[PDB]
Amino acid sequence: LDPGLQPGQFSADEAGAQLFAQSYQSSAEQVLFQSVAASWAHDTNITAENARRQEEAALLSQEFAEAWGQKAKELYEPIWQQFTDPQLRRIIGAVRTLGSANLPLAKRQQYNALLSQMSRIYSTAKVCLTCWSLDPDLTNILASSRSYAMLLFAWEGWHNAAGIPLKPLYEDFTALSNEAYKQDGFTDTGAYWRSWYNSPTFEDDLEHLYQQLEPLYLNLHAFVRRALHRRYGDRYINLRGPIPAHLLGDMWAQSWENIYDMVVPFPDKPNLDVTSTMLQQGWQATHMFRVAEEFFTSLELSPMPPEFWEGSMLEKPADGREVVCHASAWDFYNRKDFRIKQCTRVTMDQLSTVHHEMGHIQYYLQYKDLPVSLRRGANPGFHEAIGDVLALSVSTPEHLHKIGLLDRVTNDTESDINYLLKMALEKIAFLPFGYLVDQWRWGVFSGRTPPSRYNFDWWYLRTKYQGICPPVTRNETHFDAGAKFHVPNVTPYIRYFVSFVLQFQFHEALCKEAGYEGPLHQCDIYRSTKAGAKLRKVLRAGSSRPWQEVLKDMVGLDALDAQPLLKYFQLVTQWLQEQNQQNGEVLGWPEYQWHPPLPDNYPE
Ligand SMILES: *[C@@H]1O[C@H](CO[C@@H]2O[C@@H](C)[C@@H](O)[C@@H](O)[C@@H]2O)[C@@H](O[C@@H]2O[C@H](CO)[C@@H](O)[C@H](O)[C@H]2NC(C)=O)[C@H](O)[C@H]1NC(C)=O
Ligand SMILES: *[C@@H]1O[C@H](CO)[C@@H](O[C@@H]2O[C@H](CO)[C@@H](O)[C@H](O)[C@H]2NC(C)=O)[C@H](O)[C@H]1NC(C)=O
Ligand SMILES: *[C@@H]1O[C@H](CO)[C@@H](O[C@@H]2O[C@H](CO)[C@@H](O)[C@H](O)[C@H]2NC(C)=O)[C@H](O)[C@H]1NC(C)=O
Ligand SMILES: C[C@H](N[C@@H](CCc1ccccc1)C(=O)O)C(=O)N1CCC[C@H]1C(=O)O
Ligand SMILES: [Cl-]
Ligand SMILES: [Zn+2]
């Protein structure tokens, strides 16, 4: 570690800790920068030289975290928890967590190589027949092929190309992760991730939430299954069984918006898939990011700075570079550079993604004057919900009309149901998956799920929550969890399930704040500076206050709550139950063992 980046000595008291924290922040910004830059260079231009550079930068981070973490312990272990400055408690608390820096050198190099190589496998896997990439080629197939056999080729190809080679690396990764966090005092890496919510009842609270939401997911499931049955027939849909995992518009069956055309109940109302309008009108990526930006500035939030437009990668390069396509928002920790990396496609759901990713940028912008340690969401769930809150306003028919993507606007119940159904395909269908992914990973980290049951336990969770089955047999050579980006990327997932509930809480608060008197699902906070002021206060707090306190200031409750989500969807909940009863459906999948046959001359 460079001389200038090493800690000195401070007094062993709170006064000295302030100075410690100041000097830490200078050094950290410089180290975070060099690291975020090296990853950027990699993720936008995947080569061996850039990977070796990222690994060297991660190593420098680890030396840093170690020298400053050791020093925080040496000076402040007795006293940091009694400090008067709440923000300084959190900072020192962060600084003393070594994570992977607890590893000895050879194991840090191994850990870093594993992250690098899993990233590269996930992001450069192709399916050949001439080779298709996940984005855009396989995404597109899943979204709008309706050939059972072609969807299967893509689903299986993908899960095979990405899963199988990840498994040896994922096992090694898990061992090293656990080893590292055990020396911070955690029983496993999972306990560490769960500790961010700083809630003794965390697992219980989530299950109380999921139990309240499960009826909606079940009603929707049964409805969609019936729709699928009408198209794909009795051979490939069991009305009493899980849905084949490849028929729902998305590689992970995590969002079902792309099958909207098979379920929409009132096809004579305004068509709420504006994708073809966007294509007809000649939208490009730039436009999408501009329209998101303008939403933000209508709230008196900050615009994207020059550095964002000059630095971002908002399109897949055509120059034959390998990139990580999976959309992400980047803070370089220099208070100046913020960028999005996205292989933006021109569709309505990518319009949401854009807003999602811009939510992150906006958070980065508001809290950039906090100490580096506090430059994060009140919890990771907060960070994920910001863009999604705006996107709820954007998707409303009124707002789509105002940005010229919907030629007229109805305000009738048939339209409301169309709308709420679409939103349910996006939001309610995701709920089981948001919950299940980290359940799988907590199991793996704790040792409940060894390598020999990685795929067994994954599909148990898939069937249990989502009510889907693999469309071909899987076994333990397969590693289907690893064909989902967040797993090889080591990005926690429970934040999304938290986000998907929190976003309706935020929505309801901002709408009330904006003066909006009508049904929640027709609220548009566009141009509400009051709503903006309320959101800004949250963004600016970063992680400097307990999320339960920030939440209470914002929505009046100190806890995640399903009521807003439920009142948002209330009308389509009542509608779906009526339909499912009149069609004599079975809620759930009592024929849990059922799997569909192979197509006749498959794999051809
Ligand atoms: C795991 O399954 C793979 C995939 O094979 C297909 O799906 C299986 C579950 C099986 O039920 C069959 O429907 C299919 O073969 C098996 O892989 C291939 O199977 C044969 C026999 O080895 C052969 O054509 C290939 O070489 C196999 N290898 C691969 C991965 O392409 C595999 O043998 C199964 N068992 C184990 C322990 O991995
Ligand atoms: C992608 O990454 C490679 C490095 O992996 C970059 O290539 C180097 O670029 C400098 C300046 O252009 C040359 O002098 C070196 O000789 C190159 N090294 C290698 C290993 O080729 C390349 O510039 C990057 N490409 C893009 C489009 O950013
Ligand atoms: C669509 O019509 C409904 C029903 O008339 C509107 O909802 C009412 O809105 C007013 C003020 O805007 C409130 O005072 C009422 O309490 C609401 N009543 C009901 C029955 O919900 C709604 O605002 C209109 N929506 C749009 C798209 O603007
Ligand atoms: C598109 C988005 N990308 C992630 C990227 C996360 C990430 C973190 C750290 C490093 C790289 C990428 C993000 O939340 O922005 C994402 O994965 N999202 C959006 C909501 C649900 C979730 C999903 O698609 O699984
Ligand atoms: Cl999380
Ligand atoms: Zn996100």
Swiss-Prot record:
Post-translational events: Phosphorylated on tyrosine residues on its extracellular part, promoting cleavage by secretase enzymes and formation of the soluble form (Angiotensin-converting enzyme, soluble form).
Subcellular location: Cell membrane; Cytoplasm
Domain Peptidase M2: 11-590
Additional remarks: Inhibitors of ACE are commonly used to treat hypertension and some types of renal and cardiac dysfunction.
Subunit composition and interactions: Monomer and homodimer; homodimerizes following binding to an inhibitor. Interacts with calmodulin (CALM1, CALM2 or CALM3); interaction takes place in the cytoplasmic region and regulates phosphorylation and proteolytic cleavage.
Family: Belongs to the peptidase M2 family.
Record protein name field: Angiotensin-converting enzyme
GN (gene name): ACE
Part of the whole protein covered: 30 to 638 of 1306
